[PDB]
Design a protein around this nucleic acid. Structure first.
Ligand code: MG
Ligand code: MG
Ligand code: MG
Ligand code: MG
Ligand code: MG
Ligand code: MG
Ligand code: MG
Ligand code: MG
Ligand code: MG
Ligand code: MG
Ligand code: MG
Ligand code: MG
Ligand code: MG
Ligand code: MG
Ligand code: MG
Ligand code: MG
Ligand code: MG
Ligand code: MG
Ligand code: MG
Ligand code: MG
Ligand code: MG
Ligand code: MG
Ligand code: MG
Ligand code: MG
Lengths: 156, 175, 61, 106, 197, 127
RNA sequence: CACUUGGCGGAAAGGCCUUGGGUGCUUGCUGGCGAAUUGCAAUGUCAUUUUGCGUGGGGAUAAAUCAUUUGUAUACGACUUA
RNA sequence: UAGCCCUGAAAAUGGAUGGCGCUCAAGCGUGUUACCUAUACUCUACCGUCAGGGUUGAUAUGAUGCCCUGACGAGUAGGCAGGCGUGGAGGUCAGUGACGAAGCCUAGACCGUAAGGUCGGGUCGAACGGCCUCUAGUGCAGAUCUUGGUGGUAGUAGCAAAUA
RNA sequence: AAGCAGAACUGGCGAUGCGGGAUGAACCGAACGUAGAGUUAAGGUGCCGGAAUACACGCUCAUCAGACACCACAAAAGGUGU
């Protein structure tokens, strides 16, 4: 023998896990994250887009639709930590967002049904947006930081 | 057989050797390094000009307390010499390798010195006599010379989902 | 930094096993190690300590 | 618009150090516009990128990123301490970094 | 916040300006210092000339060409003050030293640029009134600087061209402010004033 | 795969080289403790090389494990290969350096049939 | 944005101010259409140096060194000559 | 009368509040906060040591084993313990090997805190290992150590007395 | 008199790294397994150099200022300087 032996061998019975005392409680959002709040996206392909907050989904994501007719952002989830909530609000109670849940955004060209669901949702969003002035152009514009901007002093 | 580290086609190459040659290793290294990489006819006429003191061998490494000459201006140095014994050994081996290239059928107009190497041979002991009844060594530094002449001849990409999506977006947005 | 009143890493100074490689003595020690652990008798602890003793520390009786 | 910036410009000043010994595990970052530790508490925990360029394309890009985060403040003039996944190369003393606005609270 | 900061050296104290410039070079800021002939040193002119002569007398005994190099120009006196405030024998301090350009006067292209000041190095703000000071252009010409006359001549030409520029710029500002005042008090101006602008 | 194990920490990956083994050729890089009276390495001055000490000792729950998670057992033939038959999750066979190429073919064939991991399957492999 | 009119600028000017027309853009105001699937974030690549190679449009058509030679030079180089 | 400043106050290479510099200081006396950072203190993880303990009518067979708890860790001279390596000897692995042993080379890999061990490739050609023990002419950087070999110096000093 | 010679008590160096005193066997702080986080000691926070060109009351202008615990120096005597 090139190597003699082990005297005794370790057991290959894998030990069971101890009983975890970690429950999953619902996430407390920020005070500014109420539905209808205009959000500023901070990351993604839609960096700097001004979108509309519609629903808190059960996977701790915010369902947004910055109206696709306005700035071309569809209904999609975002993380609440990658979003600045502004003081600007619009009312919600004209959109039916209970259809959209965590498995609505499952993975496995554009899907046919996503287009009219976008059109149904934003139809009431733009009809609400057209009341207050300059909001449609505000949401069409993309936010950026200029020279002299201090986000610690800047209030959004 | 068993030359130094060469990277050439042996079918296009011819070689010559000389071992235990009683010629200064330090002078023969500079003579070899002078013609290294040159065409064979250009190197051979340069060695005739060195023997006639028209051109010089630039001494680059073994050059401490060597006199200065204007003929090192060609090679960008100041210290150059005319090692007539080392030139005679090198050009004797240059014409031997040219004879071996003509035996193999290689084209003489395309020949260049692709490899030359001078290496230290075993020293030959002699004795010299110093003051106060002392004896010191008096050594030859012989050379092993080898040289080879040769004919002059003539990505899978990984992208993330974001990278694939941005490429497809750019192709669909630009016509 | 601690100023130690006692010597650190000090061994107890008593034998915890016989120095011999007598296999029968070692399996008398493990019998009385079990008895000194699982019985409250001071006899079993005294005999267990006496089994460790060297030849000059157990004179013939 | 002409600007597309969603980060705050910072400068990698130095490592955490005493007079004679430095600690490359902690960097010092000067975020511009920040002059007090109370102002620097806003950027506390935000992500930092040091973006640099190499001449060899590695995974479809010649631009490489080292990620980090603001851990605590440092001193009295708004300098913060940053810990990176891999430490900053120390040739970047005086190089610009990007202080992103996420994770967000305000 | 801007790529090149041009500091007008007039009225600045040499060591206080050298300390703030050396910190910014090590922090990665490109700085040009102009008008180094108008730098100030606290203390009387004779006192600062005496300590320059103390500097001049320090030299390597066996070879004066390898000794401390005594530079007489005011831009080079300021550069000696920044060295020693910068670890100039390392690559980091060397690389921080090409972010600095110091000139006598204001040469091109910096005559058409905007020059700033460092208020924590300014002599008027820092030095107590009644205390004496020397000007670096006077000290430099007393210790060997040969170009006080030609710098003052070229600065006179530059000030003449810059003063005609300012008159033209002031006239353009007067008519712009007249147009802003005409277009003020309009309905867009009420909303801009209500929004703090 | 092997048994699950904690993330393996080494505490020191650099080799402990002998002092001045870079400086002299006669001084080998096998670690020797400096025992001179004035040695800065023995006195642990700042900026000097570190010394092997027991604080660098590896975790007992992951000591002797390869990055594959197995412990290494050196085998010379099929009989020494078969002792790891019930311990495929904890031991990986490694063929000894002096095993001839025809004997290694038999060892790899048996280890594939027994589920044994071999850490040098390409040694003396004609290709 | 090229084109063009003229002036000023030598401190390191290499920039500044002008004349005219063309060619776009214009968010000064009001409309219509498009964006999605980069899938909840990955700098997500947009800058400026340097050097090649290729193509097609102008432009120009030398010297230095060695060797020989001088001695206003010189240990050798170097220098000064032809 | 006593605070700062000044005179008293002169040494040899050029130079030292550490340097630059500093003048309502970046000096001096005092006071209040904030801030920086030691291998120090607190908490945690891992290593080792020491101590106190648990564990047999399957301790789900390994009791010098496994496990629990707490504290601790500087070190010359020196003491002790546990290990690594080399030549040879008894036993065992019916061990390895001309389909390539040993040796040697290898900014190739793995294991060990380490002494070291293991593997891949090249060269090579005939013997050599693991483990339990026994034994010693058993580990080198020094000793103006011994023997052999080799450098820098260095193509250097020099090869100039005796007329050519 | 001495960085001189000799004693007493204790603490140190020798035998010991680490932070500070620029530098240093003995001074100050603190004594050391491998790491992480935090807080500190002595010392400091214009720049070198991490950290307030902090706040507050005054004093000082030196044509040899001063910024020296150990420690790397200064005295008697004087000055309508203040
Ligand atoms: Mg000579
Ligand atoms: Mg002789
Ligand atoms: Mg620090
Ligand atoms: Mg290791
Ligand atoms: Mg090691
Ligand atoms: Mg060794
Ligand atoms: Mg000692
Ligand atoms: Mg004070
Ligand atoms: Mg110890
Ligand atoms: Mg043996
Ligand atoms: Mg066999
Ligand atoms: Mg072999
Ligand atoms: Mg090697
Ligand atoms: Mg044979
Ligand atoms: Mg011996
Ligand atoms: Mg030896
Ligand atoms: Mg020794
Ligand atoms: Mg010797
Ligand atoms: Mg000679
Ligand atoms: Mg003669
Ligand atoms: Mg002693
Ligand atoms: Mg120290
Ligand atoms: Mg000192
Ligand atoms: Mg600082």
């Amino acid at each position: 023998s090139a190597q003699k032996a082990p005297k005794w061998y370790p057991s290959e019975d894998v030990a069971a896990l101890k009983k975890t005392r970690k429950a999953a409680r619902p996430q407390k959002l920020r005070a500014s994250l109420v539905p209808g709040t205009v959000l500023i996206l901070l990351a993604g392909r839609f960096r700097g887009k001004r979108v509309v907050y519609l629903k808190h989904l059960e996977d701790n994501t915010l369902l947004i639709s910055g109206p696709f007719k306005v700035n071309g952002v569809p209904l999609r989830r975002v993380n609440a930590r990658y979003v600045i909530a502004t003081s600007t609000k619009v009312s919600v109670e004209g959109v039916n967002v209970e259809k959209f849940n965590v498995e609505y955004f499952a993975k496995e060209e554009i899907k046919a049904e996503r287009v009219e669901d976008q059109k149904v949702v934003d139809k009431a969003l733009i009809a609400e947006i057209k009341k207050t002035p300059l909001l449609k152009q505000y949401l069409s514009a993309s936010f950026s930081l200029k020279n002299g901007d201090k986000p610690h002093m800047l209030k959004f | 057989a068993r030359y130094g580290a060469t990277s050439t086609n042996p079918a296009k190459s011819a070689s010559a050797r000389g071992s235990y040659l009683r010629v200064s290793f330090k002078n023969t290294r500079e003579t070899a390094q002078a013609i290294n990489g040159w065409e064979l006819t250009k190197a051979q006429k340069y060695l005739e000009q060195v023997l006639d003191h028209q051109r010089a061998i630039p001494f680059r490494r073994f050059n401490s307390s060597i006199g200065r000459t204007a003929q090192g201006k060609e090679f960008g140095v100041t210290k150059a010499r005319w090692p007539a014994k080392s030139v005679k050994f090198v050009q004797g081996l240059l014409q031997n390798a040219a004879a071996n290239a003509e035996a193999k059928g290689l084209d003489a107009t395309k020949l260049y010195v692709s490899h030359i190497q001078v290496n230290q041979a075993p020293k030959q002991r002699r004795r010299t006599y110093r003051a106060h009844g002392r004896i010191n060594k008096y050594e030859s530094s012989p050379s092993h010379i080898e040289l080879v002449v040769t004919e002059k001849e003539e990505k899978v990409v990984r992208l993330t989902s974001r990278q694939r999506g941005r490429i497809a977006a750019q192709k669909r947005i630009a016509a | 930094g601690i100023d130690h009143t006692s010597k650190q890493h000090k061994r107890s100074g008593h034998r915890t096993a016989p120095k011999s490689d007598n296999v029968y003595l070692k399996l008398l020690v493990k019998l009385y190690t079990f008895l000194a652990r699982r019985t409250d008798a001071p006899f079993n602890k005294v005999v267990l300590k006496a089994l460790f003793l060297s030849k000059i520390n157990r004179p013939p009786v | 618009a002409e600007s597309h910036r969603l980060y705050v410009k910072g400068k990698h000043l130095s490592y955490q150090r005493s007079k004679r010994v430095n600690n490359p595990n902690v960097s010092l970052i000067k975020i511009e516009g920040v002059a007090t530790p109370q102002d620097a508490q806003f950027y506390l925990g935000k992500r930092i990128a040091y973006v640099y360029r190499a001449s060899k394309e590695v995974r479809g890009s010649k631009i490489r990123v080292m990620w980090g985060k603001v851990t605590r403040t440092h001193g009295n003039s708004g300098v913060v301490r940053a810990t990176f996944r891999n430490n900053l190369p120390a040739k970047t003393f005086g190089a610009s970094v990007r202080i992103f606005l996420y994770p967000s609270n305000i | 916040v801007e790529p090149v900061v041009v500091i007008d050296g007039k009225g600045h104290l040499v060591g206080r300006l050298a300390s703030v410039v050396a910190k910014q070079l090590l922090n990665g800021q490109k700085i040009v210092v102009v008008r180094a002939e108008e730098l100030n040193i606290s203390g009387e002119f004779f006192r600062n000339k005496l300590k320059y002569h103390d500097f001049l007398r320090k030299a390597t005994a066996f070879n004066k060409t390898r000794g401390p190099f005594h530079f007489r120009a005011p831009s080079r006196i300021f550069y000696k003050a920044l060295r020693g405030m910068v670890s100039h024998k390392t690559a980091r301090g060397k690389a921080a030293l090409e972010r600095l350009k110091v000139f006598e006067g204001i040469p091109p292209p910096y005559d058409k640029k905007k020059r700033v000041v460092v208020p924590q190095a300014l002599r008027v703000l820092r030095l107590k009134p009644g205390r004496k000071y020397t000007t670096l252009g006077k000290l430099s010409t007393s210790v060997g600087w040969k170009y006080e006359d030609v710098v003052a001549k070229l600065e006179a030409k530059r000030k003449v061209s810059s003063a005609e520029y300012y008159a033209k710029k002031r006239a353009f500002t007067k008519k712009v402010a007249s147009a802003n005042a005409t277009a003020a008090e309009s309905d867009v101006a009420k909303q801009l004033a209500a929004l703090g602008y | 795969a092997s048994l699950p194990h904690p993330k393996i920490v080494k505490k020191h990956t650099k080799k402990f080289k002998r002092h001045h083994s870079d400086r002299y050729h006669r001084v080998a890089e096998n670690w020797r403790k400096q025992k001179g009276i004035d040695s800065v390495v023995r006195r642990r001055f700042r900026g000097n090389i570190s010394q092997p000490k027991i604080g660098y000792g590896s975790n007992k729950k992951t000591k002797f494990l390869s990055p594959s998670g197995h412990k290494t057992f050196l085998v010379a033939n099929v009989k020494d290969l078969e002792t790891l038959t019930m311990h495929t999750k904890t031991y990986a066979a490694e063929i000894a350096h002096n095993i001839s190429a025809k004997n290694r073919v038999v060892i790899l064939a048996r280890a594939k049939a027994l589920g044994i991991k071999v850490t040098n399957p390409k040694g003396r492999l004609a290709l």
